UniProtKB/Swiss-Prot annotation, chain A:
Changing residue 3 to A: Delayed phosphorylation with a 10-fold decrease in the initial phosphorylation rate. 71% loss of binding to lamin A. It is linked to Nestor-Guillermo progeria syndrome: An atypical progeroid syndrome characterized by normal development in the first years of life, later followed by the emergence of generalized lipoatrophy, severe osteoporosis, and marked osteolysis. The atrophic facial subcutaneous fat pad and the marked osteolysis of the maxilla and mandible result in a typical pseudosenile facial appearance with micrognathia, prominent subcutaneous venous patterning, a convex nasal ridge, and proptosis. Cognitive development is completely normal. Has a helix-hairpin-helix (HhH) structural motif conserved among proteins that bind non-specifically to DNA. LEM domain proteins bind centrally on the BAF dimer. Changing residue 49 to K: Fails to promote HIV-1 genome integration. Belongs to the BAF family. It comes from Homo sapiens (Human). Changing residue 49 to A: Reduces LEMD3/MAN1 binding. No effect on Histone H1/H3 binding. Changing residue 32 to E: No effect on histone H1/H3 binding. Its main location: nucleus. GO terms for biological process: chromatin organization; chromosome organization; DNA integration; mitotic nuclear membrane reassembly; negative regulation of cGAS/STING signaling pathway; negative regulation of innate immune response; negative regulation of protein ADP-ribosylation; negative regulation of type I interferon production. Changing residue 31 to E: No effect on histone H1/H3 binding. Non-specific DNA-binding protein that plays key roles in mitotic nuclear reassembly, chromatin organization, DNA damage response, gene expression and intrinsic immunity against foreign DNA. Contains two non-specific double-stranded DNA (dsDNA)-binding sites which promote DNA cross-bridging. Plays a key role in nuclear membrane reformation at the end of mitosis by driving formation of a single nucleus in a spindle-independent manner. This is Barrier-to-autointegration factor. The modification N-acetylthreonine is found at residue 1.
Length: 88, 89
């Protein structure tokens, strides 16, 4: 199942949306991502793409980078995967 | 229009699974070196462009270091990704 946050993200180009528009990325995760350079959703999309959309490696990278738990990283992965299926 | 037809074809549509050689500036020689470093689909190079926050200097220097692109090749590749993003991201 999906959140409305997920459905809102996958419905449209992400443009300059902040990293916190990604499903799973709340205030705490978003702050830690911004501190490490990932201030916009497209920067995280970039890492997803550099990693060739690999679920295990992306979710592990996200845990290592901002401390996402398994649900948060699952949510973030799935919203980027569905966004790419629609727009890339 | 001063862009290549190859730029125009790339920016006209989502890139999907297009190979790296569909990018403007990326001929067969650069495309092979990119593929050997893991950058086998155009979207992987898009990924690097985005991870570098679309910065021209960083992206063009990365392309030079990774496949030996010259100034014109790196400018063309950057401009193609920049216009693609303006259209579709």
């Amino acid at each position: 199942t999906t959140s409305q946050k997920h459905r809102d993200f996958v419905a449209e180009p992400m443009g300059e949306k902040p990293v916190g528009s990604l499903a799973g990325i709340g205030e705490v995760l978003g702050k830690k991502l911004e501190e490490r350079g990932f201030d916009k959703a497209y920067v995280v999309l970039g890492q997803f793409l550099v990693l060739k959309k690999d679920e295990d490696l992306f979710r592990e990278w996200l845990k290592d980078t901002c401390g996402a738990n398994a649900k948060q990283s699952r949510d973030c992965f799935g919203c980027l995967r569905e966004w790419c299926d629609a727009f890339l």
